[PDB]
Structures are given as structure tokens and as C-alpha cells.
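Lecture notes, unit on binding sites. The following record was shown on slide 14. It pairs a sequence with calcium ion.
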Amino acid sequence: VVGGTEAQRNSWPSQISLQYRSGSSWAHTCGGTLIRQNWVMTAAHCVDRELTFRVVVGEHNLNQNNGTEQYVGVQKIVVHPYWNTDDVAAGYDIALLRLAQSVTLNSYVQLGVLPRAGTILANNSPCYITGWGLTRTNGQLAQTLQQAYLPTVDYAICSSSSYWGSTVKNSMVCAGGDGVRSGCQGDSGGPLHCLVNGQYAVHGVTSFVSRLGCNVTRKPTVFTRVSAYISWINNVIASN
Ligand SMILES: [Ca+2]
């Protein structure tokens, strides 16, 4: 997250860190959202490569033991069947990971609230992006979880020629673009928490930003719109 600030200790309890084994150690690669004790929601492009993954819940500082973490392996990976690694712009950037074991819910670990199917947010709706991603274009990962206010940009404005044009589809959500704050590499797969009726719900899964950079004016971070996949998500967790 570029232009963000350190989130309070475990203040976004559904946020997870997706990591892969690098020889004899582990490295953070993407974010994700705990939606069931044994299911995590993330981006399909985070799990396209055949590596060994593990999920860390209750995480805050990636480089030190905070005494709140739970480390668990990944048993099954279910990518949306229409996902195309070579066309992220085509959408369908979403995947569900069945964990090898159910984590224990507590003060630091809780389930993320999903929106009702078909829910679209009004322009400039209040949302926050969280993640351990790059704190600057071509920079380095954040050691502690970061957060940044990132209001939405409706489809009409976001799909116009002044912003993303036709690269963005209605199955996506745009947020940010103030040229200062945004998602960045490493935040992918993470949540976009939006305030709806007094409650924070995960309306997006971080998908992509501009090739030119992370924080680019009129180039909002683009997220997979969760509300468009509710039926898919339920069908997966009901038959797996
Ligand atoms: Ca830690």
C-alpha cells in the first residue's frame, strides 16, 4: 500500500498473508480474506504458479513474532474456471483456498463479512485497503500491516476514457486514484473493506494497478467485485 499508515494491532482480523516456500524460508506474496474457519478468498493470479503455499492469520509484523499468529497449510486451490492468466483485464481474478486445518477464531482472527450478491456501491463510497504490499512503486514490502483510505470510483467514471477506459469491466470495483494512495504489488488478493450500513464488508479482492506505477492519478486500483461472485463462492464451499 502506497501512501498508507500502520494499521492498529490486529484491527482488520480477517486479513491474511499468503506466503510461499523459498528454499528453506517463507516469503509473503499476496493478501487474502478469511471467509470461513477453513476457507480463504484471494486473487487467482496469486496462485497461478505451482508453489507451496501457507496462510498466516492474526499477523501484523511479518518479520517478528507478535504472539497472535496461526500458521496453516493450503490443502486445495479452487480458481474461478474462467480465469485467464494472460488476460487479467478479462476479470475472474478470484480463487478460494481450503486450508489443511481450521484456524481458531479469537480477538485477532475473525471472519470477513461478504456483501449481498449484486450489491454496487455509490461513487466515492468510504473504503480502506489493507496489505503488506510495496509502500512505493518498485519499492519494498511493508513489515507491518498498512491501511489507506481509498474511496470508490463508480463504473461509469472508471470505465470512461479519462480513467481506465474499456480495460475495466462491471465485474470490477475501482478505488483511489488521488495519485498519492493505492494498492501495489504484494497487496494483491487482499480485501477492500467498505462501510455499508454501519458495518465493514469486503467488497473487493485487490487485482491490479497500472503498469506505469501503483499510485498514478486517474488510475485507481482495480478490484474483483466480490458481490458478483457470491453464488460461485457459496457453491464452492458447499461442494468441497
Ligand atoms: Ca509476526
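Take-home: The longest helix spans residues 230-238.
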